[PDB]
Amino acid sequence: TMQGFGVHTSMWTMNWDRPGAERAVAAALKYEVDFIEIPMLNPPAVDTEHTRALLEKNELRALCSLGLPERAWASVRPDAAIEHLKVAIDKTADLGGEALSGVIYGGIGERTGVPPTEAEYDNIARVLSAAAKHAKSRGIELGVEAVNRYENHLINTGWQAVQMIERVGADNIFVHLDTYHMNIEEKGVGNGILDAREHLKYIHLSESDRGTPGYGTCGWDEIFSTLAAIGFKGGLAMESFINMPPEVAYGLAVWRPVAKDEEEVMGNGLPFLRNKAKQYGLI
Amino acid sequence: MTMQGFGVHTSMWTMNWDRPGAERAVAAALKYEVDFIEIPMLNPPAVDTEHTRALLEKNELRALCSLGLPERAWASVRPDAAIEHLKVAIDKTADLGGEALSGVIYGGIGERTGVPPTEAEYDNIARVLSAAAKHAKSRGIELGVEAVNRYENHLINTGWQAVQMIERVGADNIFVHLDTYHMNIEEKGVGNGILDAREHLKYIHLSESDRGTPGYGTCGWDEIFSTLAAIGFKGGLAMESFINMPPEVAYGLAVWRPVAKDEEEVMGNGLPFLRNKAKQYGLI
Amino acid sequence: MTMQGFGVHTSMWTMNWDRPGAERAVAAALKYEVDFIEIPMLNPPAVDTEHTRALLEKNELRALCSLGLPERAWASVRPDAAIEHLKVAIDKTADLGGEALSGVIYGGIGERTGVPPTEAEYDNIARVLSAAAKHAKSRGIELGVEAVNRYENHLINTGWQAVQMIERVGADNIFVHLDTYHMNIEEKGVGNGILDAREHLKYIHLSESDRGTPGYGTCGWDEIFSTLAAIGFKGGLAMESFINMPPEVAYGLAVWRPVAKDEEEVMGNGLPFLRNKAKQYGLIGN
Amino acid sequence: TMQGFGVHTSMWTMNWDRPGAERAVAAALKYEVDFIEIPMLNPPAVDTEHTRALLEKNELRALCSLGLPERAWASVRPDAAIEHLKVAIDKTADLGGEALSGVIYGGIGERTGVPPTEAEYDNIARVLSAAAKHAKSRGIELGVEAVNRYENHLINTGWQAVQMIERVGADNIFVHLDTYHMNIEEKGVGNGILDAREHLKYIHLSESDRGTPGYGTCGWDEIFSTLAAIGFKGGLAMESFINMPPEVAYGLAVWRPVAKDEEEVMGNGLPFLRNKAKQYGLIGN
Ligand SMILES: O=C(CO)[C@@H](O)[C@@H](O)[C@H](O)CO
Ligand SMILES: O=C(CO)[C@@H](O)[C@@H](O)[C@H](O)CO
Ligand SMILES: [Mg+2]
Ligand SMILES: [Mg+2]
Ligand SMILES: [Mg+2]
Ligand SMILES: [Mg+2]
């Protein structure tokens, strides 16, 4: 039921330790967002009580996201993926999060060199069924983020994400789209939204170069008009890679700055997105 | 009006719907393999309804008709004459096998007071459209209200204004008719016209921003088609270009120079572009 | 002229260029840190040039003027009346410190014969603009010819037509003025107007497709800004949004409903957008 | 001097073997393009005089493209890279090709895990200088194609490619842009064209998902307006991986069909692109 505008906290914190959480919440207040997305690079280390109290005091909602580490890629090590996800689901639920989303079906860097196979998808479906039931037991939902061909060869489009949701058969898994990935993957950016429309509950609003929304190659008018047209009432989450911790950035093929500074990205990008949301009547 | 698929406004071959003109237009429709034609009715009384009916039926073609009111019958100021004009056009549309009368049926090209539209004007329009809608209902057809840009008419320029008139009238057989060329000027983001009209949108003119070749101008086609798909549009996708319009009609529409090279450019590049986009975004 | 940087057509802030309106406009221009304002020259005898000049120099603002000709002086058909009107307008522009007189200086906003333009009309215009260009030269200012859409004028609608008139007149102090709202209607791909006009282009109205807030309509801004960067554009970038409507051109401009909530929404959201695009595409001066 | 429209032959054949050359040249003539772009991925395996005969016979021009294999990535193994490029240059010359372009400076799929270093660019520059001399020896030019961050970590933007061209100092190396790559890397697609304007001689007009141009997220009006604005006069080349050369498949990451078939891409994409070139008055159209 995540609604309104939010921010992926990577711009201030990929390490969700005590000072990092305080720093991200502080930013969230400064930009008057409705929610934050909390990356969980190391779920066991998260202080759930601190974060809960922070979200409650500051009347902020949250969800969490991750991508599977290689020791636990679901396509090939599903039992370890289930174990990794159960820990992340519990931490998410305990800190007050409403969903765990992201690359929860695999990891950044998976690539076999040939098309995804039924054996791989079978393993993913088994992992997501296990994890969805655990999520349900803690009262949260799972999100599946479609990412571009280079990061993962399994779920790149909204239509692929929907197929996996159908193969799993749960009711608490939604699609999570990201405009930067859709800019590469969708045959017309609106088609990712169209194909996912029955399951789309969250979208990363990111520019085509991970810099400043409004200043790249994404078709924002098409994106926003199509979200309004399908009655999108889910989470509008700004994602930019500015000020990413270096080794995490290098993991995402950031070889060079995506933008001048946080003042360019947040000062120009959030108003652009909020303005478009008002323009097309998502508010 | 259940009109569906692709069609063409026949102005590229005929603005005078006489006997050879109707045959010329139907011949074009077959060549480009469209599902329906839009028949301009510049002079409704002169239309041979039986000839056109037979032609549509024999060739498996659907149709609607469209018009703008002449000044002697602008509805905002001369509603009684507007009603009389529309009744004749509605009867001719139904009798030729048409499923709707659409267009600038609420006023005319060239209305302008210099100030915002007034409630008195809208009251006269609503009375005309209510009378016309009743008459259309009795003949089994629907009416369409085409939003046009600020310079052609000062009364209905956006999808949201068109929906407000439909609500003011309260009929069930009036729909909205959008035109990408007018939306390109009037809508605050072109998809917003579709969004605002979504509960009433049954027909759209796919026209380029300069009235030339769709795909080669300033209209935002991906937003247009994505948004049509996203609202589940299943109405008429009608191509409109001003290529080869008769001069007098063209001058009345502010065509001061060619909109395109020739029909081969317009139909040969523009129709495939639009069919391709329709398939791309799943309207097909 | 040498106009560079960002400016605003003063309809953003006032309906007429009277003394209180000039006060209100210059004060608003200062809270946005623009480099110049564009002042309508619709009632030349009514402009208090000493008052305006003092305001401009005090607040270190540059200016130019624009107009459309009234029907009594449409150059198409009443060229001698047009020469006289333009001479008065030029003098007032020069007097108040403005650096150019631009816009629809060749005809009316809302001018239309009902038929395509003729050589007789273009010949009259050329004669008027030659005479007007000599008088501008005598007062130290330039003239601009703005292409406007088919519904506002039937004579010059595209960058290519504007350049053809500039080359027909053969003056050296007349430049082309484009407007993205008009190009959105007239140009077969918006960048083509910029390309066609590139050798004479010194000024552009960055106006949204519905005269509203730039960034929130149907104009193709990335194409516009990339093409302006590519041709080396170095002239004025001016906003034009009819928050207020000068009465003498209201009928031709056809703003029958609000273009935007208010001046704060257009300047607060549109100017940053435009400045940010100019910097994104590396526009000379940024 | 490549002018007009051409097609990268992955449109029609996976490998440039003898039957693939015959099938690609036949299709190229059916669509009346001016040139084809031939992958030079296994130089020893190319039958040059067979291809040369086909090209001359069918009044077709050609250039070659490649990415370097890991054994000869210029950034880490510069001497192997020089040797490999000389072999590829000689074969491109022998078959009548007029340039060797693409990722001639590195691998399709090359990544260290960290940003590029000066040591890497120093090696590439040395490689390209030597390669440029030998290309001149055989009378062809070299092209440097910027590719997106996921295929190479070294040259990703028009401005980076120009910086390497200025560093090497050679007269006969041009910049090669790709709209699919610029869709990801350029901060506004036209900026890649603007940044590379002094050296830009070749452009891949490739849709954002490698499918049919005109049916993705590439900003074609911006692309074509800016090309006209800078006076682009070089080659306009389609690139759609209907067929996937085996040696670069892992790096190009085409895991599902980019389009129905080569008829859909050529039948819809090429007229779209020819029509835009005419619309914006591109020199040669
Ligand atoms: O864009 C236009 C025409 O509609 C304007 O620049 C000029 O008419 C100025 O408003 C001069 O009055
Ligand atoms: O766009 C690209 C790289 O992704 C291609 O031009 C090159 O890889 C050449 O085709 C060489 O294979
Ligand atoms: Mg994301
Ligand atoms: Mg229409
Ligand atoms: Mg203007
Ligand atoms: Mg390429």
Strand B36-40 relative to strand B62-68, pairing: parallel
Which is the closest atom of ligand 1 to the Cα of C179?
1
Contact C34, C237 (CB under 8 A): no
Token pair recorded at residue C218? 């149907």
Dist. CA D137–CA A106, nearest whole Å: 50
Contact D53, D25 (CB under 8 A): no
Q: Considering only CB atoms, which chain C residues are within 8 Å of A279?
A: 216
3-state secondary structure D80-94: HHHHHHHHHHHHHHH
Instruction: Find the helix or strand (DSSP H, E) in which B120 lies.
Output: helix B119-138
Dist. CA B46–CA C175, nearest whole Å: 52
Dist. CA C83–CA C74, nearest whole Å: 9
Dist. CA D125–CA D105, nearest whole Å: 9
Q: Whose CA is nearest to atom 5 of ligand 1?
A: C103
Token pair recorded at residue D61? 């021009």
Q: Which residues of B179-189 are buried (b: 16+ CB within 10 A; e: fewer)?
A: bbbbbbbbbbb
Could you tell me the distance, in angstroms and rounded to a whole number, from the CA of residue C175 to the centre of ligand 5? 14
**For ligand 2, is residue D110 a contact (CB within 6 Å)?**
no
Angle of CA points B47, B48, B50, to nearest 5°: 140
According to DSSP, residue C140 is labeled: T
Upper half-sphere CA count for residue D145 (Cβ side, 13 Å): 27
Dist. CA A55–CA B85, nearest whole Å: 66
Place of tokens 């015959």: D22
Instruction: Find the helix or strand (DSSP H, E) in which C64 lies.
Output: strand C62-68
Instruction: Find the helix or strand (DSSP H, E) in which A224 lies.
Output: helix A220-229
According to DSSP, residue A127 is labeled: H
Measure the CA dihedral C225/C231/C234/C238, to 10°: -40
Which is the closest atom of ligand 2 to the Cα of D37?
10
What one-letter code names the amino acid at A83? E
How far off is chain C from A266, nearest CA to CA, in Å?
13
**For ligand 1, is residue C121 a contact (CB within 6 Å)?**
no
Place of tokens 């990703």: D156
Contact A238, A218 (CB under 8 A): no
CA distances from D136 to A242, C209, D92 (A): 43, 52, 12
Contact D219 A217 (CB under 8 A): yes
Dist. CA C237–CA C219, nearest whole Å: 15
Token pair recorded at residue D238? 């389609």
Cα first-last separation, chain D: 16
Q: What's the burial of A172, exposed, middle or buried (CB within 10 Å: 0-12/13-18/19+)? A: middle
Place of tokens 């001479």: C87
What one-letter code names the amino acid at C73? A
Upper half-sphere CA count for residue D224 (Cβ side, 13 Å): 27
Dist. CA B221–CA B276, nearest whole Å: 11
Tell which one of D66, D92, D108, D238 to mutate to probe ligand 2, the residue whose CB is within 8 A of the most ligand atoms.
D108
Angle of CA points D175, D176, D177, to nearest 5°: 115
CA distances from C22 to C55, C59, C100 (A): 8, 12, 18
Provide residues of C within 8 Å CB-CB of chain D: 188-192, 194-195, 198, 220, 222-223, 225-227, 229-231, 280-282
Token pair recorded at residue C69? 């000709």
Contact D54, D79 (CB under 8 A): no
Q: What's the burial of C146, exposed, middle or buried (CB within 10 Å: 0-12/13-18/19+)? A: buried
Q: Is B176 helix (H, G, I), strand (E, B) or coil?
A: strand
DSSP chain B: ----EEEEEGGGT-SS-SHHHHHHHHHHHHHTT-SEEEEE-SSGGG--HHHHHHHHHHTT-EEEEEEE--GGG-TTT-HHHHHHHHHHHHHHHHHTT-SEEEEETTS-TT---SS---HHHHHHHHHHHHHHHHHHHHTT-EEEEE---TTT-SS--SHHHHHHHHHHH--SSEEEEEEHHHHHHHSSSTHHHHHHTTTTEEEEEE--TTSS-TTSSS--HHHHHHHHHHTT--SEEEE---TT--HHHHHHTT--S-SSS-HHHHHHHHHHHHHHHHHHTT--
Dist. CA D225–CA C194, nearest whole Å: 9
Contact D194, C281 (CB under 8 A): yes
DSSP A144-182: EE---TTT-SS--SHHHHHHHHHHH--SSEEEEEEHHHH
Instruction: Find the helix or strand (DSSP H, E) in which A22 lies.
Output: helix A18-30
Dist. CA D115–CA C131, nearest whole Å: 63
Place of tokens 């609608």: C157
The residue from B38, B99, B121, B146 that is catalytic is B146
Closest by CA position to C250, among listed B156, B153, B149, B115 = B115
Which is the closest atom of ligand 2 to the Cα of D180?
1
If you measure CA to CA, which chain B residue comes closest to C155? Answer: B256
Q: Which residues of A113-147 are buried (b: 16+ CB within 10 A; e: fewer)?
A: eeebeeebbebbbbbbbbbbebbbeeebbbbbbbb
Contact A34, A6 (CB under 8 A): yes
CA R_g for chain C? 17
Closest by CA position to D90, among listed D66, D69, D125 = D66
Contact A97, A84 (CB under 8 A): no
Token pair recorded at residue A113? 């060199």
Could you tell me the distance, in angstroms and rounded to a whole number, from the CA of residue C205 to the centre of ligand 5? 5
Dist. CA D37–CA D205, nearest whole Å: 13
Closest by CA position to B209, among listed A190, C193, C190, C178 = C190
Contact B203, A168 (CB under 8 A): no
Quickly list H helices, chain C.
Answer: 19-32, 49-58, 79-95, 119-139, 159-169, 180-186, 190-197, 221-230, 250-253, 263-265, 271-280
Q: Whose CA is nearest to atom 11 of ligand 2?
A: D66
Q: Whose CA is nearest to atom 12 of ligand 2?
A: D66
List gaps in chain D by the residue before each (C–N > 2.5 Å). none
Contact C125, C107 (CB under 8 A): yes
Contact D101, D63 (CB under 8 A): yes
Contact D3, D234 (CB under 8 A): yes
- Beta-ladder partners of C9: C38
Dist. CA D240–CA B103, nearest whole Å: 43
Closest by CA position to B211, among listed B3, B12, B6 = B12
Q: What's the burial of C195, exposed, middle or buried (CB within 10 Å: 0-12/13-18/19+)? A: buried
Place of tokens 């005090």: C58
**For ligand 2, is residue D39 a contact (CB within 6 Å)?**
yes
Dist. CA D211–CA D267, nearest whole Å: 12
Strand B100-104 relative to strand A35-39, pairing: unpaired
Please name the member of D190, D224, D230 whose beta carbon is closest to the beta carbon of C281.
Answer: D190
Q: Which chains touch A (3 or more CB pairs under 8 A)?
A: B, C, D
Token pair recorded at residue B160? 């949201």
Q: Which of A268, A273, A274, A282 has the most C C-beta neighbours within 10 Å, making it the best mutation to test the interface with C?
A: A268
- For C115, other C-beta atoms within 10 Å of its C-beta total 12
- Beta-ladder partners of B201: B176
Dist. CA B64–CA B3, nearest whole Å: 8
Dist. CA C105–CA A235, nearest whole Å: 51
**For ligand 2, is residue D103 a contact (CB within 6 Å)?**
yes
Q: Is D100 helix (H, G, I), strand (E, B) or coil?
A: strand
What one-letter code names the amino acid at C2? T
Has B187 been annotated as catalytic?
A: no
CA distances from B81 to B65, B68, B132, C65, C174 (A): 19, 13, 12, 46, 51
Measure the CA dihedral D78/D80/D86/D88, to 10°: -110
Contact D255 A184 (CB under 8 A): no
Dist. CA B41–CA B46, nearest whole Å: 9
CA distances from C225 to C220, C232, C280, D188 (A): 9, 11, 9, 10
**For ligand 2, is residue D176 a contact (CB within 6 Å)?**
no
Resolution expressed in Å: 1.8
DSSP A61-102: EEEEEEE--GGG-TTT-HHHHHHHHHHHHHHHHHTT-SEEEE
Dist. CA B221–CA B180, nearest whole Å: 9
Token pair recorded at residue C5? 């940087």
What's CA C201's distance to the chain center, in Å? 12
Token pair recorded at residue C157? 């609608």
Could you tell me the distance, in angstroms and rounded to a whole number, from the CA of residue D49 to the centre of ligand 6? 26
Token pair recorded at residue B245? 């319009």
Could you tell me the distance, in angstroms and rounded to a whole number, from the CA of residue C258 to the centre of ligand 1? 17
The pair phi, psi for residue D216, each rounded to 5°, is: -150, -140
* Interacting residues of A19 by C-beta distance below 8 A, sequence separation 6+: none
What one-letter code names the amino acid at A187? K
Closest by CA position to A145, among listed A112, A185, A104 = A104
- Beta-ladder partners of C142: C100
Quickly list H helices, chain D.
Answer: 18-30, 48-57, 78-94, 118-138, 158-168, 179-185, 189-195, 220-229, 249-252, 262-264, 270-279
Experimental technique used to determine this entry: X-ray
Provide residues of A within 8 Å CB-CB of chain C: 214-215, 268, 271-272, 275-276, 279
**For ligand 2, is residue D54 a contact (CB within 6 Å)?**
no
How far off is chain A from D237, nearest CA to CA, in Å?
20
- The count of CB pairs under 8 A between chains A and B is 78
Which contacts of C86-89 are long-range, i.e. CB under 8 A and separated by 24 or more positions?
A: C86/C128, C86/C131, C86/C132, C86/C135, C87/C132, C87/C135, C88/C44, C88/C45, C89/C41, C89/C44, C89/C65
Dist. CA B99–CA B140, nearest whole Å: 8
Dist. CA C267–CA C245, nearest whole Å: 16
Q: Is D235 helix (H, G, I), strand (E, B) or coil?
A: strand
The residue from A37, A98, A145, A185 that is catalytic is A145
Contact B217, C188 (CB under 8 A): yes
The 3-state DSSP composition of chain D as helix, strand, coil percent (nearest 5) reads 45, 15, 40
What one-letter code names the amino acid at D181? H
Dist. CA C197–CA D86, nearest whole Å: 47
The pair phi, psi for residue D143, each rounded to 5°, is: -120, 145
Dist. CA B193–CA A204, nearest whole Å: 26
How far off is chain A from D258, nearest CA to CA, in Å?
9
CA distances from B114 to B117, B141, B165, D15, D156 (A): 9, 35, 21, 68, 55
Provide residues of D within 8 Å CB-CB of chain C: 187-191, 193-194, 197, 219, 221-222, 224-226, 228-230, 279-281
**For ligand 2, is residue D7 a contact (CB within 6 Å)?**
no
What sign does the dihedral D116-D117-D118-D124 (CA atoms) show? Answer: negative
Dist. CA A189–CA A198, nearest whole Å: 17
Dist. CA D217–CA A190, nearest whole Å: 10
Measure the CA dihedral C84/C90/C92/C97, to 10°: -170
Contact B99, B63 (CB under 8 A): yes
Token pair recorded at residue B159? 């999808």
